[PDB]
Amino acid sequence: QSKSRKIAILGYRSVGKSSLTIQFVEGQFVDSYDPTIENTFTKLITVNGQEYHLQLVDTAGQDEYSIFPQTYSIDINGYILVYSVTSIKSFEVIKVIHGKLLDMVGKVQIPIMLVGNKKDLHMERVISYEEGKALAESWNAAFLESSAKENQTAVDVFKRIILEAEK
Ligand SMILES: Nc1nc2c(ncn2[C@@H]2O[C@H](COP(=O)(O)OP(=O)(O)OP(=O)(O)O)[C@@H](O)[C@H]2O)c(=O)[nH]1
Numbered sequence: 519q520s521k522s523r524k525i526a527i528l529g530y531r532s533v534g535k536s537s538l539t540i541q542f543v544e545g546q547f548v549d550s551y552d553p554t555i556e557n558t559f560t561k562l563i564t565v566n567g568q569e570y571h572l573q574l575v576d577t578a579g580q581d582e583y584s585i586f587p588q589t590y591s592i593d594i595n596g597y598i599l600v601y602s603v604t605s606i607k608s609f610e611v612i613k614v615i616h617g618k619l620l621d622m623v624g625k626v627q628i629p630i631m632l633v634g635n636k637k638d639l640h641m642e643r644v645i646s647y648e649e650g651k652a653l654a655e656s657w658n659a660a661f662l663e664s665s666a667k668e669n670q671t672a673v674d675v676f677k678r679i680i681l682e683a684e685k
Pocket residue numbers: 529530531532533534535536537538548549550551552553554555577578579580635636637638639664665666667
């Protein structure tokens with residue numbers, strides 16, 4: 519009765535995919551990483567009395583030139599799409615990523631959510647909250663902003679994708 523879930527985290531490089539994930543899994547914030555390498559963490563969390571066994575696939579960053587498969591993996595239960603609120607490039611990229619992702623998954627009922635990370639960098643913001651929100655809304659996707667410096671916001675992200683998959 520302990521459920522098993524695999525989540526893939528996608529996004530442009532340096533948006534904080536690894537930082538968010540590491541914050542969630544190990545409760546700490548890093549300043550460095552291995553950018554171009556796929557990393558897969560395991561995490562146990564209880565959500566609403568229900569135990570979940572998480573596999574989190576921290577992917578190598580993608581851009582407009584990254585290859586997306588034409589078919590989906592049945593063993594992946596949700597997708598977290600991450601951009602940085604400090605990078606317009608990361609934001610335009612996340613739209614391309616989403617579009618190719620939709621090509622891959624088709625109409626299958628596997629949730630995809632949108633996360634604008636680095637909300638703590640107040641003075642470097644180039645993407646408004648509204649733009650992220652309305653993008654997500656246009657995808658019928660959940661939206662959150664986050665800071666890998668703030669454990670609760672990282673928790674909220676992974677908690678939310680699990681809640682979407684359970685719908
Ligand atoms: N202030 C602040 N810095 C962040 C945040 N998230 C990530 N960073 C910093 O941004 C840089 C890139 O973060 P990563 O987690 O390595 O980004 P990534 O998406 O894993 O990048 P790739 O692995 O190359 O795809 C690192 O120096 C982090 O410390 C954040 O939420 N707030």
